[PDB]
Design a protein around this ligand. Structure first.
Ligand SMILES: C=C(C)[C@H]1CC[C@@]2(C)CCC[NH+]=C2C1
Ligand SMILES: C=C(C)[C@H]1CC[C@@]2(C)CCC[NH+]=C2C1
Ligand SMILES: [Mg+2]
Ligand SMILES: [Mg+2]
Ligand SMILES: [Mg+2]
Ligand SMILES: [Mg+2]
Ligand SMILES: [Mg+2]
Ligand SMILES: [Mg+2]
Lengths: 304, 304
């Protein structure tokens, strides 16, 4: 699959090597893997590497928080594929009061105390910004087991749903936390169209590279949890082409979304609405798009 | 607008110029054009040229029949844009028993006697092959004023409707008539998938090039008859991109349909199911797709 030309230059956080070893090492000690093969596959995924590609301008003392969060969510994301929608919902809902810190974790259950200790440490570093990630994460978690996954969706309906299932808002709040980048409610409101456009890029780029993984999952995992829910399958179905043909077409659309990102950013500046914070923000969103693509093209999670 | 590479090479019927003058001349003599500007625009469209590009291997004494049919359908196609769905339906339904030869035409009304004389002349030349064009034409006519045009559609839903509105079936029966290519019901059943694939190509290629014409029509003509119903609008709405962005993506999809055409034809041959008639037929479909693109690229109908 040859990617069409992009003007975006992907950037990686300079501390990616040490943070990856730190965070991978943490999960290897605490997380319950089924076997040595799974432990190797975990490291092979490079979960801290995505994070460092998503937020390359995160503060040096905050990047590890982001790596820990995306890592545990990735691990949960895989676990949910072997559960029903009901079981998956129960699993996630239990982690929500724990994430808030309102309920103590069962220290014998790794996922419970990993989540608790993480959010506690994040609030310890920056309480105000850590709290602003809470609701976006919960929105993402509840989307993962949404019944709409078991209903037919057009491309438009899917992308609207997938903004939550891909965790667009959490990525936004996580990015701001990691950068210590604060925005007023007025600034946040102004870039909503830019956010929605970015979400489609992230979602479809992931759909493109994770298709083989998710096709296999749909044939082997739970009938509900492993369900095939992706723009690749939808376009292939609607246009009556192969999945690989759908990928090539979708990749072209992703480049159009990149063009639209630049247009919207230019218009924000052409109008009076550009601020230093917003400039850093929309630039950060570009890194998410290019970083997500670079990681997707190289991670063993999708190629194996 | 840069067309992505294609391996389909267009062919034109050798007698295109002489038949154009004959068919253009007939309509200029009989059809009720409002003024000289409309008569010039009519000639500028090249309705016989597209027909000769659609069926370049039509028999020398049958190509004019195809040119007449497509020309009169094109003329009605524009007429319908100033009518409501109701008026458009009543207009078309009147012509249907006339086309069958069951109802005599009003000789003071050009469209009625032109359509009557056409079908009578076609039945005289080849009774059986002419009759097999009737219902496909009627299916197309009724799709033109279908109220599904004014209702929400996804890409898949549009394409399945478009197959009727683009007259894929009538074109196939017209091609067979023009070439004297007779196929058994079983043979035709073998290439159903190939027909469906070809329909999408013809539809979207037309949508891409005729968008500006149809955008203008939607803003100037009847809100119903001139309604903007096209893949360019649908995809742009689904993916939240501009029409120009949608065009570029759709053009890539068109090339995927070309690849699929070659795949399906290759499979048909390998299974020992490609009869000499079927070989001529599927080649004929390729001429339709390539011929449609060449004409769309150059006709003044879409450029002015
Ligand atoms: C952890 C997840 C599965 C969510 C957050 C990260 C992100 C965007 C990385 C790419 C794959 N999907 C997701 C969703
Ligand atoms: C006459 C028509 C409007 C129908 C038949 C010819 C064909 C495919 C040529 C291209 C434009 N539209 C059509 C539809
Ligand atoms: Mg997943
Ligand atoms: Mg998921
Ligand atoms: Mg995926
Ligand atoms: Mg038209
Ligand atoms: Mg039409
Ligand atoms: Mg058109």
């Amino acid at each position: 699959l040859e990617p069409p030309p992009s003007t975006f230059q992907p950037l990686c956080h300079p501390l990616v090597e040490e943070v990856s070893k730190e965070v991978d090492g943490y999960f290897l000690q605490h997380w319950n893997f089924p076997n040595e093969k799974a432990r190797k596959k975990f490291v092979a995924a490079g979960f801290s590497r995505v994070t460092c590609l998503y937020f390359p301008k995160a503060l040096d003392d905050r990047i590890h928080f982001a790596c820990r969060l995306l890592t545990v969510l990735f691990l949960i994301d895989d676990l949910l594929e072997y559960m029903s929608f009901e079981e998956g919902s129960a699993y996630n809902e239990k982690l929500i009061p724990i994430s808030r810190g309102d309920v103590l974790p069962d220290r014998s259950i790794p996922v419970e105390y990993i989540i608790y200790d993480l959010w506690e440490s994040m609030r310890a570093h920056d309480r105000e910004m850590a709290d602003e990630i809470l609701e976006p994460v919960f929105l993402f978690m509840r989307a993962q087991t949404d019944r709409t996954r078991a209903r037919p969706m057009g491309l438009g309906g899917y992308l609207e749903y997938r903004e939550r299932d891909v965790g667009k808002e959490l990525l936004a709040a996580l990015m701001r936390f990691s950068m210590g980048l604060k925005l007023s409610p007025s600034e946040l409101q102004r870039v909503r169209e830019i956010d929605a456009n970015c979400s489609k890029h992230l979602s479809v780029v992931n759909d493109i590279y994770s298709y083989e993984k998710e096709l296999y999952t749909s044939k082997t995992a739970h009938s509900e949890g492993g369900i095939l829910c992706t723009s690749v399958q939808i376009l292939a179905q609607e246009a009556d082409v192969t999945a690989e043909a759908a990928k090539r077409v979708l990749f072209v659309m992703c480049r159009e979304w990149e063009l639209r990102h630049q247009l919207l950013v230019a218009r924000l500046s052409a109008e009076g609405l550009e601020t230093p914070g917003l400039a850093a923000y929309v630039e950060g969103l570009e890194y998410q798009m290019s970083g997500n693509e670079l990681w997707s093209q190289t991670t063993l999670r999708y190629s194996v």
